[PDB]
Amino acid sequence: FQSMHTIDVIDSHTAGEPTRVVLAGFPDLGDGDLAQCRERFRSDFDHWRSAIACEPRGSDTMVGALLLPPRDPSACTGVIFFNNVGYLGMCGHGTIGVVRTLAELGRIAPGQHRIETPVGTVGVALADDGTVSIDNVESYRHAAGVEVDVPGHGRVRGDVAWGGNWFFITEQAPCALGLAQQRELTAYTEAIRLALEAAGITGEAGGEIDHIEISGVAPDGSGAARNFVLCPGLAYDRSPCGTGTSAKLACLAADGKLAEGERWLQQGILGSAFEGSYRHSGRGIAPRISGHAFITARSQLLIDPADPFAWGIVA
Template structure:
């Protein structure tokens, strides 16, 4: 979480500030999160002043390859970090992101966070993708849903793979092949938006489902993925498999879990609510040599 630079992002909207970060500070994004300071799976959160005065803060998320639209697990991390710093009391607060304002609830333990994500949807169902170059798959194709949960996802259930940590190499190879096939076959989200996440879903022994998520930058998510869980909830809702108010628990490839429910807003959209926890593990000053 980048703090102390809240005034550096310029723009009349958070979407404009996201573009400003990409155009003016992109060169810093990868060095902040990558080795030797971190690793390629870390998501950064560049804090800024909010545009909307009803919000306590604004944030633009980024990773090792650029800026993001939204990030669920990073939202949980931001709120838990602000609580640890003493700047945010338990209760309900409003956080402004490039995709809209989200309501977050900090629980009394200072580590557990619930938040309502942006409106999520299943855009297309049962989309077949030919994947001839993946020897890991039972067939030379997969069928999945295209869904939005703050980022665009292609969600696959019929992969036939074991979602276990000792199988990460095979899971990475498979999801990379699927991602390449999506690009080659011109399969996109709404309005041609890039599907930059691939989510494999399977059974779990301690939750309702377990996932493996390939993220932009070609690293895999260690969390159950907040936007990915939101996308899954939207798919379950569209299929009539999860009713509003019912709880869906999703386990990550590392064993952590998110709880999710949803409501239907006045426009008929699915509004997921996720609950997870985070702990602060370091407070550091990053040094960069100007060359």
């Protein structure tokens, strides 16, 4: 491989959900702020996003994390997150991945740090055992006990809540919450999403409810909390979902079922788990989400100019 563009990346996952941290070989995006860099990326280097995050090198679940020098001097790195369709702002699981990646590279040590994104700087903490805690945006419940009739299923009740995204959170599912049921769970949650849209059920100020969360239990009779989360691309979250867990904490807090400072353990569909807690803040809560990430590969992505899909498979 001498004929090929090389991109150095470290892959990890955060409770099952993958992050690809880009270390070297990426074109320079200029000396503007991170949002200016994100727009330069979008306008002039979009083929690089697809090369890294779309098939065949990436997938529908992959988030890329491009490291850049921080412009906020209180931050240990800047980052731009992206995926197989476009560019993100903040990304919880990806931030946990970035933190653990930097730690494994020897670039940061345990303690408090900050991560700068195009839409602001996120506070994080790295524990001696590698646990990463992140501060989620303020979360709250917009409506409780909303009912929608779901074709092929029946009446479904849930809460509408903001965790940094809009969620409909229901306790009802037509099967066990396990990986073996993902296709059925995906179809069911997609039907809920469509039914909500058709019924005109939205978040505040007409916000589209584009995340669906089933808040149930692990199917081992333990009664442990487990969720399933359908993300906007019709892909399920392999992790317990930071924003979705934060939205759940907001509902627990509003119902008086979880106290300030009290720990909440949330499994996701794979049985991996996040820890959540909150402090009361305004009309809602300030959530703190803790999770683990593990490095899965160190790679040189190789881009062969003769490859018809050199820059990724794109419809």
